[PDB]
């Protein structure tokens, strides 16, 4: 995995959010991969990580890189923001992100970080 690579695979699921392209999402992972957010149990597997986009994408996200990537040893870790309005009510959530790719350079676990000081009216 080259750091271009992750990189461009950064890249691409941020513009993939931005697209609403689901099965866009859903290619960059592994079919076994874990997703672990803030606040929840992880889950696994290409049917769960379906299911975590497409209620996320119930909502018009608007996502964007805050800083450079890193990527190196396999591993990426990225700052963004994610924009929605629900109700009339705009949210800004600020998490960093980290992947880890397997051989075939799909992600096989990720992980979102953000707490309450990163969730911003
Ligand atoms: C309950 C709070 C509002 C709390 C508050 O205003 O203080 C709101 C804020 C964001 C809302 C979520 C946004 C995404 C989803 C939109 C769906 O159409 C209904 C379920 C979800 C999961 C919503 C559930 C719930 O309606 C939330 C979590
Ligand atoms: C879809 C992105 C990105 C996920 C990732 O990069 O791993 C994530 C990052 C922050 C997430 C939000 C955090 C606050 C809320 C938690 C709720 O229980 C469900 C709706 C909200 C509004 C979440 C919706 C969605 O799950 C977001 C916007």
Redesign the pocket.
Known sequence: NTPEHMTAVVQRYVAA?NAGDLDGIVALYASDAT?T?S?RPPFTGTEAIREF?AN?LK?P?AVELTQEVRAANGEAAFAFI?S?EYQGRK?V?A?I?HFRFNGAGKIVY?Q?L?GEKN?HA
């Open positions: 959010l997703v957010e606040f986009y996320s909502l996200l994610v929605f949210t959530v998490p992100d990720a979102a953000f969730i």
